[PDB]
């Protein structure tokens, strides 16, 4: 029952079975490397990946910096035996952790079942292995055997934290996306992880720790395993399908590369960035590719290069693709079994669902970009357990994701140099001097990943304007509700945990297996250092003004952004002028503790203010200082912000106003069926049901647009407010500490100040503020949805209803002969149904108790 049923040490002797030197497909001539078979069809190679790609043999930083927020290099990592032993144990521990969850047990079983298809012949009737889905296993006597395998975990390439799933290609076959599948090579390290900021959780967890949290490497590995799952079943989305962004405006990222395959794999809100028209195209496409496999098995009359029988191999693929087989031996794809399998691989196996099973803190979206790299070590039980990861039960790390908090659990996280420099990739944003005064421009650099995600309109497609023929055939969809924990359990119960495919004997391949990694689209660098001359101070200027670097002078707060940007000893605050005065005053040692007491009260009071309002649709609270914290709406003052918000609604928050384009909806054409009452009536019922679906389709589309175009904007402001609050705490702490350090050693001894206590209390206050800010911003996001996007859908939908009503009434009259005895009842039904809107229910489209309880 454990996934890894053997203890593996790097220096264990080879046995040619599960501990051996192996060779993998290669462009040139690789030497054998020591590897471990930790489970049927899965090997681990504790080596840096200098093998799989011949253009990637050097382990040093590259000439051109990778265009990624966090990268890390160390040519000496994983070069010693002890590191390789620790690497191996880390990976096996992580597999056990994944396997210990119902969801991971199901994913790993799917991976073992997902043998690459035997499509290596070009003969129409022959089953044959593809050799790049194999390895050579050297035996203790120095001979070798060849074996099929599904999955290899290997150490990273030069960028130690670039984790990804690689595989060898085919001259004609695109194995990862044509339904065949291919052996997957994951570059992965258990020895490092990412740090991310998170503030969404403060309401459920008000004592959430300060600073960065670490991603649990189990989540990270599970993410790569999910890609490996798609690719083994040949249903990966082509990497030329990317979510393209606008990059022209000053506030927009210079560039961003996020694949559809990535959005899918993340799940949650991110996967909903992809509209139904594209979703359904994919699903129909993979369905047809599975049908071709079934067909190819029906045409197969022989098998070569193994003693395994044709019956055995056909059966392996029956099970892999969950094909149906009739009593005559003929394979087919059942639509319902396919939809289940495809839904499990693409919607059940997601990062977001793994996070739910691990009960860990994790980024909620790919747009919550990693901010740091940490050295970790998960092998010792005192650091990390298979059931609890870092959050060890019955310790202070059990609650509030404390185990993942890199400041609280600092013995487990060593922060490394990020080799992406802070302004390696940036835009230069300059307030024209004359705006401030002729005086010099106020120009600041802004890190690429601090800018706004603005998705290209090309990403959102629909066929809403497309007419539709309605027939007596109901052609009516089922509900298809969102992946619940109960649904997952029901997949779990179905699941085949019985009989993995066997390790069969195949004939020996050549000593060097020739292979080239799958051809990838080339990616153009995005431009860098682009300069914008602006006629206003931006949120980026307001935020930068709140920062300070290393120095000797006493920092002073100022209510002037301009003063702060110009003087490294001056820091902008949106707090009151009384706070400025109180925090900046020379304070004698006898009044120090009273002064800190007051500042913490004032800091809390200022950051906890909430105004209530009845004058805004779907917004019942306002946090006024967001106005001057970030120059929202370019009004410098809170009164200006509260009023502006009442006057214009949630739109004043946005850096850009989305297009939400809903065309005239395609009209329904009804097939007539003279001489048949039941079919004519069915056609009227079908019209009305499809009209109900039409409202649902428009709403679902609008939500996708809103999630991607609007909610993302609000999320970033939410993150900048947390940064702004942190900046105020750090500045206030630096000033208080400077004052303390002016005192004599007698006064300090008497006072016995603990700056850690102050940090804690301020962090507590920041959490309380963020509870209010998150609730507020949530309201704004949903209000904007409710009041500025959805009504465009509603108007078009009511237009459609009105037209349909006329169509259906004409149809009843034109068929009143046939309908004789049924004309009046159908009139009422048509009239009733089409006289009232189908209410928008947000809960129907998005699952997040955060955005839903606003509704």
């Amino acid at each position, epitope marked *: 029952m*454990p996934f*890894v*049923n*053997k*203890q*593996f040490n790097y220096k264990d002797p080879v046995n040619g079975v599960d501990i051996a030197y192996i060779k993998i497909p290669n462009a040139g001539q690789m030497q054998p490397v020591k590897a471990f078979k930790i489970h049927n069809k899965i090997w681990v190679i504790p080596e840096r990946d200098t093998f799989t790609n011949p253009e990637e043999g050097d382990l040093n930083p590259p000439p051109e910096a990778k265009q990624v927020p966090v990268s890390y290099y160390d040519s000496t990592y994983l070069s010693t035996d002890n590191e390789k032993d620790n690497y191996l144990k880390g990976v*096996t*521990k992580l597999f*056990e952790r994944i396997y210990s969850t119902d969801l991971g047990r199901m994913l790993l079983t799917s991976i073992v079942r997902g043998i690459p298809f035997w499509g290596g012949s070009t003969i129409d009737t022959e089953l044959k292995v593809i050799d790049t889905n194999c390895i050579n296993v050297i035996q203790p006597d120095g001979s070798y055997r060849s074996e099929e395998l599904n999955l290899v975990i290997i150490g990273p390439s030069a960028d130690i934290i670039q984790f990804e799933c690689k595989s060898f290609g085919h001259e004609v076959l695109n194995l990862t996306r044509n339904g065949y599948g291919s052996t997957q090579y994951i570059r992965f390290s258990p020895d490092f992880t990412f740090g991310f900021e998170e503030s969404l959780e403060v309401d459920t967890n008000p004592l959430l720790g300060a600073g960065k949290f670490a991603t649990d490497p189990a989540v990270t590995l599970a993410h790569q395993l999910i890609h490996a799952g798609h690719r083994l079943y040949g249903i990966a989305i082509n990497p030329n399908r990317v979510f393209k962004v606008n990059t022209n405006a000053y506030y927009e990222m210079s560039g961003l590369e996020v694949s559809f395959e990535e959005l899918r794999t993340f799940g949650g809100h991110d996967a909903k960035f992809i509209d139904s028209l594209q979703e359904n195209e994919f699903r129909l496409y993979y369905y047809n590719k599975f049908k071709d496999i079934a067909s190819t098995l029906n045409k197969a009359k022989s098998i070569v290069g193994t003693t395994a029988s044709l019956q055995y191999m056909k059966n392996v693929f029956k099970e892999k693709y969950l094909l149906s087989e009739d009593t005559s031996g003929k394979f087919s794809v059942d639509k319902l079994k396919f939809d289940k399998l495809y839904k499990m691989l693409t919607e059940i196996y997601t990062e977001d669902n793994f996070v739910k099973f691990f009960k860990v803190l994790n980024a909620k979206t790919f747009l919550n970009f990693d901010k740091a790299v940490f050295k970790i070590n998960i092998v*010792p*039980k*005192v*650091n990390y*357990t*298979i*059931y*609890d990861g870092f959050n*060890l*039960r*019955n310790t202070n790390l059990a609650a509030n994701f404390n185990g993942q908090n890199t400041e*609280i*659990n*600092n*013995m*487990n996280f060593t922060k490394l140099k990020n080799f992406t420099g802070l302004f390696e990739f940036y835009k230069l944003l300059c307030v024209r001097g004359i705006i401030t005064s002729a005086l010099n421009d106020l120009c600041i650099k802004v890190n690429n990943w601090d800018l706004f995600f603005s998705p290209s309109e090309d990403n959102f497609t629909n066929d809403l304007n497309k007419g539709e023929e309605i027939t007596s055939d109901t052609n009516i969809e089922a509900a298809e509700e969102n992946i619940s924990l109960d649904l997952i359990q029901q997949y779990y119960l179905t699941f085949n945990f019985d009989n993995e495919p066997e390790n069969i004997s195949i004939e020996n391949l050549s000593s060097d297996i020739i292979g080239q990694l799958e051809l990838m689209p080339n990616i153009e660098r995005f431009p860098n250092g682009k300069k914008y001359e602006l006629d206003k101070y931006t949120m980026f200027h307001y935020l930068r003004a709140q920062e300070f670097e290393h120095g000797k002078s006493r920092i002073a707060l100022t209510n002037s952004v301009n003063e702060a940007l110009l003087n490294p000893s001056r820091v902008y605050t949106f707090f009151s002028s009384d706070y400025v005065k109180k925090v900046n005053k020379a304070t004698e040692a006898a009044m120090f503790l009273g002064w800190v007491e007051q500042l913490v009260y004032d800091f809390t009071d200022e950051t906890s203010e909430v105004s209530t309002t009845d004058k805004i649709a779907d917004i019942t609270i306002i946090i006024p200082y967001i106005g001057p914290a970030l120059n929202i709406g370019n009004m410098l003052y809170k009164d200006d912000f509260v009023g502006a918000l009442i006057f214009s609604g949630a739109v004043i928050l946005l850096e850009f106003i989305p297009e939400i384009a809903i065309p005239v909806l395609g009209t329904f054409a009804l097939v007539s069926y003279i001489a048949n009452k039941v079919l004519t009536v069915q056609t009227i019922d079908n019209a009305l049901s499809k009209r109900n679906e039409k409202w649902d389709e428009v709403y679902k589309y609008i939500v996708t647009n809103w999630l991607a175009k609007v909610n993302t904007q609000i999320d970033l402001i939410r993150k900048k407010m947390k940064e702004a609050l942190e900046n105020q705490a750090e500045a206030t702490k630096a000033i208080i500490n400077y004052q303390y350090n002016q005192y004599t050693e007698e006064e300090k001894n008497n006072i016995n100040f603990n700056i850690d206590d102050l940090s804690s209390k301020l962090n507590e206050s920041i959490n309380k503020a963020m509870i209010n800010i998150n609730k507020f911003l949530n309201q704004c996001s949903v209000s904007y949805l409710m009041n500025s996007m959805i009504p465009y859908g509603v108007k078009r939908l009511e237009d459609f209803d009105a037209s349909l009503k006329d169509a259906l009434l004409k149809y009843i009259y034109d068929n009143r002969g046939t309908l004789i005895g049924q004309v009046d009842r159908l009139k009422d039904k048509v009239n009733n149904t089409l006289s009232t809107d189908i209410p928008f229910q947000l809960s129907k489209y998005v699952d997040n108790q955060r955005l839903l309880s606003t509704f």
Partner: nanobody, 124 residues
Framework: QLQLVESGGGLVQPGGSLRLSCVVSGSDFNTYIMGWYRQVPGKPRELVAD???????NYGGSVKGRFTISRDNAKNTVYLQMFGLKPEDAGNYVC??????????????????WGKGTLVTVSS
């Protein structure tokens, strides 16, 4: 489920001696890998010494012969005899009951047993 109660901690002077003991409530005490771990606030537990079901002992790199771990199966007790105490030895001394399960230990899963500890303080 096992309860573990440590005793013997207190304030010790640098160079001084201590004898820690832990009594375990339960059964098949002699089934377990018994250990002593040191923990300071804001830090992970750290192995000081442990002893196999067969009496085989293992010690942290800082011990260097100064301490001795021992077990008495008829009394369900583990002992840690400590000499030449240093300021680095200060901490909560927590007894651990662990055992093998397949390729892993119960500790690795996270399901093993830990006492509240007995505090060791080293004076200036």
């Amino acid at each position: 489920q096992l309860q573990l109660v440590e005793s013997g901690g207190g304030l010790v002077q640098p160079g001084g001696s201590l004898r820690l003991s832990c009594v375990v409530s339960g059964s098949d005490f002699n089934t377990y890998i018994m250990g002593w771990y040191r923990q300071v606030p804001g830090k992970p537990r750290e192995l000081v010494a442990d002893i196999t079901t067969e009496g085989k002992t293992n010690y942290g790199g800082s011990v260097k012969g100064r301490f001795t771990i021992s077990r008495d199966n008829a009394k369900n007790t583990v002992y840690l005899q400590m000499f030449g105490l240093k300021p680095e030895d200060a901490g909560n001394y927590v007894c651990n009951a662990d055992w093998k399960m397949g390729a892993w230990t119960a500790g690795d899963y996270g399901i093993d047993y830990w006492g509240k500890g007995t505090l060791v303080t080293v004076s200036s």
